[PDB]
């Protein structure tokens, strides 16, 4: 068969004599989208000889089919059915009123079975090791958190088994792929406060620290532009094809702003219902709220020519195809104005579901404000850790309170839905609700990890802190050596979820092993 991954075969038999049919397909997860032509089914030449057409339908989400008379342009019937991968289905259209009935010729496969088995195998190894062991300065929980984010990042970037829930969301919502980048920004803010407090307490000058901050930011941005962004398999670099934004550029700009702000308003940590960690940094909070107001004003009030004001949508076929070139609204307009199309990301995640043609950069200029807000919430987590380190109860109470406040803000902004909130969660736009949701997740993760790993010591963070102590080396390495063996080899079946998943799991485990080897040899690179 010619079915690709996540496709099903749909045979359409038209038993109507005097009506040609057009089949329109729509995904249930494509919001306010247009129907697209699936296949044209000619009329039956004679009674008893139904004309037949075959099409491939995507099986990742539910499908909506609309059969339309191609001359009268009126609807004969409609189906909403969830096809299964590699299934063989038939749709018969017959008189007596026109009734279309769907039949299953060959049953589909269970496409999520490899993930179910992989989790069971991983759980079995965990229990066996934990049971077997029973018979026989630096905060470890932050390293554990950063290493969990790194392991998820390596699994997702290498393919995620080609599963849609291990890829980035098209426009709105969350998948597993969308969680780790905000967590990196959060952890980097926490590390900003921890490192700077230690350095300034030891007696270092503020200008020497300023030079160190500037050097680190410059070097992060340069590595992102020159080493990570370009696809050098396509050919030598030309300026007109150079993408300026990116992941490390975002981290460098965010690090510079937040670190300089902390340095400029730095205070010694003093020596319990108190708000000292909040009120001692009120200039920081005022500047952060002004930046957030700037993001909201630009997102909702800046007029974009040939586009609605306050547009939060993917363009393409979405929003009923009314704004095909409006992917991003103000964010995309500001990117295209200051940098130009050719210096932006050319493969936005909305292209596959909404068929967008314009270039949109997820790490663009406008979302750096919300990136800074995420890093500053991480700074607050570090402030809690250092202000109340003598009291575990105080730290846990404050982590719980921040998690609850940010979760309530997320509930209010999103209305607990993918597309219907005032500000729906969106990684491409780096929305405010995106930041509050992932920040409440991060505060809860720390609420669990701090007492287990740092205070009680029931768990040492293995094997997560090994890459967490070599994050920049792991990141740049997995970018440089993505196509190399043993991370990537040729598969016997490229349309198999099982083979892709096995390959991606093996490559992630290899990066964990590399980080462990570097830890044992005491080789640590800090950018």
Ligand X SMILES: CC(=O)SCCNC(=O)CCNC(=O)[C@H](O)C(C)(C)COP(=O)(O)OP(=O)(O)OC[C@H]1O[C@@H](n2cnc3c(N)ncnc32)[C@H](O)[C@@H]1OP(=O)(O)O
Ligand Y SMILES: *[C@@H]1O[C@H](CO)[C@@H](O[C@@H]2O[C@H](CO)[C@@H](O)[C@H](O)[C@H]2NC(C)=O)[C@H](O)[C@H]1NC(C)=O
Active-site positions read 168
Closest by CA position to 479, among listed 237, 150, 218:
150
43 scored as a contact of ligand NAG (CB under 6 A): yes
Task: Pick one of 1, 28, 37, 42: the residue that binds ligand NAG (CB under 6 A).
Answer: 42
DSSP sequence for 70-86: TTT--EEEEEEE-PPTT
Cα angle: 478, vertex 233, 242; to 5 degrees:
90
**Would you state the structure tokens that stand for residue 404, as one six-digit string?**
């609850």
Q: Quick check: 478 and 227 in contact, CB under 8 A?
A: no
- The site partner of 347 among ligand OCT, ligand Y, ligand C14, none (C-beta below 5 to 8 Å per kind) is none
Looking at beta carbons only, is 21 or 453 nearer to ligand NAG? 21
Contact call for residue 208 and ligand C14 (CB under 6 A):
yes
Question: What would the two tokens of residue 439 be?
Answer: 């920040």
* Number of CB atoms found within 10 A of residue 324's CB: 17
- Least Å distance, CB 117 to ligand X, is 28
285 binds, among ligand OCT, ligand Y, ligand X, none (CB under 5 to 8 A by kind): ligand OCT
DSSP 450-484: IIIIIIS-S---TTTHHHHTSHHHHHHHHHHTTTS
| 25, containing H or E segment | strand 21-27
Neighbours of 460 (CB within 10 A): 12
To ligand Y, the closest distance from the beta carbon of 75 in angstroms equals 4
The CA-CA-CA angle for residues 190, 196, 202, to 5°, reads: 140
Asked whether position 414 contacts ligand C14 by CB under 6 A, the answer is: yes
* Residue closer to ligand X, measured from CB, 188 or 366: 188
1 binds ligand Y (CB under 6 A): yes
Can residue 71 be called a binding residue for ligand CLR (CB under 6 A)?
Answer: no
Closest approach of Cβ 514 to its own copies, in Å? 14
Site residues for ligand NAG, 51-110, by CB under 6 A, read 71
Burial of 80 from C-beta contacts in 10 A (0-12 / 13-18 / 19+): exposed
- Residue 18 contacts which entry, ligand NAG, ligand CCCCCCCCCCCC, ligand Y, none (Cβ below 5-8 A, type-dependent): ligand NAG
Burial of 260 (0-12, 13-18, 19+ CB in 10 A): middle
In the complex with ligand CCCCCCCCCCCC, the residue whose CB is nearer, 236 or 270, is: 236
In this chain, which of 103, 121, 301, 506 binds ligand CLR, going by CB under 6 A? 301
| Interacting residues toward ligand OCT by CB under 6 A | 118-119, 121-122, 244, 282-283, 285-287, 289, 339-340, 343, 505, 509
| Interacting residues toward ligand C14 by CB under 6 A | 113-114, 117-118, 121, 126, 129-130, 173-174, 205-208, 210-211, 214-215, 217-218, 221, 252-253, 256, 260, 263-264, 278-279, 282, 285, 403, 407, 410-411, 414, 418, 425, 437, 440-441, 444, 459-460, 462, 498, 501-502, 505-506, 509
């Amino acid at each position: 068969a010619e079915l690709k991954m996540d496709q099903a075969l749909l045979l359409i038999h038209n038993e109507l004599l005097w009506t040609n049919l057009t089949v329109y397909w729509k995904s249930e997860c494509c919001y306010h989208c247009l129907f697209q032509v699936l296949v044209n089914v000619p009329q039956s030449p004679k009674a008893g000889k139904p004309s037949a057409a075959a099409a491939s339908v995507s099986t990742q989400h539910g499908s909506i089919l609309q059969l339309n008379d191609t001359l009268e342009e009126k609807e004969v019937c409609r189906l909403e059915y969830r096809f299964g991968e590699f299934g063989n289905y038939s749709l018969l259209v017959k008189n007596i009123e026109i009734a279309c009935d769907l039949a299953v010729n060959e049953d589909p496969v269970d496409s999520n079975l490899p993930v179910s088995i992989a989790f069971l195998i991983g759980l079995a190894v965990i229990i066996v090791i934990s049971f077997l062991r029973l018979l026989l300065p630096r905060l470890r929980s932050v390293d554990t958190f950063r290493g969990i984010a790194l392991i998820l990042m390596v699994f997702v970037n290498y393919g995620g088994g080609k599963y849609w829930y291990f890829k980035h969301a098209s426009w709105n919502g969350l998948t597993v792929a969308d969680l780790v980048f905000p967590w990196f920004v959060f952890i980097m803010g926490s590390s900003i406060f921890l490192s700077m407090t230690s350095i300034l307490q030891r007696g270092c000058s503020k200008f020497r620290l300023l030079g160190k901050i500037a050097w680190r930011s410059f070097l992060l941005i340069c590595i992102g532009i020159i080493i990570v962004n370009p696809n050098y398999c396509l050919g030598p670099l030309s300026w007109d094809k150079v993408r300026i934004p990116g992941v490390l550029q975002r981290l460098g700009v965010t690090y510079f702003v937040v670190a300089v702000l902390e340095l400029l308003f730095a205070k010694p940590v003093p020596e319990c219902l108190s708000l000292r960690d909040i009120t001692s940094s009120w200039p920081q909070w005022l500047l952060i709220l002004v930046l957030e107001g700037l993001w909201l004003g630009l997102t909702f009030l800046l007029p974009v020519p040939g586009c609605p004001t306050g547009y939060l949508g993917p363009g393409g076929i979405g929003d009923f195809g009314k704004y095909p070139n409006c992917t991003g609204g103000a964010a995309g307009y500001i990117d295209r104005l200051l940098l130009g199309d050719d210096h932006l990301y050319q493969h936005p995640s909305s292209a596959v579901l909404y068929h967008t043609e314009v270039a949109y950069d997820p790490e663009g200029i406008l979302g750096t404000i919300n990136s800074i807000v995420m890093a500053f919430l991480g700074v607050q987590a570090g402030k809690i850790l250092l202000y109340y380190k003598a009291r575990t109860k105080d730290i846990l109470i404050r982590f719980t309170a921040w998690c609850c406040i940010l979760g309530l803000i997320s509930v209010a902004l999103t209305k607990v839905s993918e597309n219907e909130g005032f500000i729906p969660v969106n990684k491409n736009l780096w929305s405010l609700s995106y930041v509050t949701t992932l920040s409440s997740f991060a505060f809860f993760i720390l609420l669990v990890l701090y007492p287990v790993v740092d205070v009680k010591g029931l768990w040492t963070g293995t094997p997560f802190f090994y890459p967490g102590m070599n994050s920049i080396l792991v990141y740049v390495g997995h970018e440089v050596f993505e196509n190399y063996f043993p991370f990537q080899w040729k598969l016997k079946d490229n349309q198999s979820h099982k083979e892709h998943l096995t390959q991606n799991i093996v490559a992630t485990a290899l990066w964990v092993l590399i980080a462990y080897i570097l830890y044992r040899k005491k080789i640590f690179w800090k950018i």
